[PDB]
Amino acid sequence: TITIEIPEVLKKQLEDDCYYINRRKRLVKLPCQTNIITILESYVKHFAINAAFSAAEKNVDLCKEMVDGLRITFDYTLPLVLLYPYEQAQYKKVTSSEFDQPPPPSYIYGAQHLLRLFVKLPEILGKMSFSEKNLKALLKHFDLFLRFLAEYHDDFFPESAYVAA
C-alpha cells in the first residue's frame, strides 16, 4: 500500500478543520479569496526559483505536471469523497450559481479542501497502476508540496476562512 506522510503541522490543521465543521458548526466561506488555482500557481513560482538558486527533485516541468494533476484530481474528487455531511448543502448551492456551466471545484475551494485530498490520495493512486520509477518521483513531489504547504501554513490557513452563516 501507498503512504503519503503529512507534516504534523498540517496533520493538526486537518484536525482543527474537522472540529470547526461538524462540531463548532462552521463552513469555509466560498468562494475563497485565495483559491486552489492560485495556491498551485504560487507553488510553481516558488519551485522554479528554489531550483535555479539552491545549495526529478529539481525538475520544473515535472513539477508542473504534478500541479495540473492535482487540480484535475481535486475537481473530480471533491464532491464525491472530500466533503463532510454538513458541507453538502453548500456544494449544491455553490455550483448552481465559460458557457455558463458549473464552475469547477478548483476555482471555488481553497487550502482547506486541497489538503483533505492528500488524505485520500494514496487510495486513489493505488487504483491507477503507476510504474515504479514514475510513482516515487511523484510521491517526492507531493512531499515537497506538503513541505511548502507546512512552511507557509499561517498564510494559507487563516482562521477567518471559516463562517457561521
Binding site: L14, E15, C18, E65, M66, D68, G69, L70, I72, T73, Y76, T77, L80, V81, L82, L83, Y84, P85, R116, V119, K120, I124, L125, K127, M128, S129, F130, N134, L138
Partner: protein
Amino acid sequence: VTSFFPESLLITPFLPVVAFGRPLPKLAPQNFELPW
C-alpha cells in the same frame, strides 16, 4: 428469448480523463474521515 447472442459486440476504446499520466479511477461517494 432463445439466444443470448445477437458486430455490436465490438468494443470502442474511449478517451480517459488523465491525472499524473494515469486514468482517473472509480470512486463511490463517501463521507470524508481522517484515518486517525
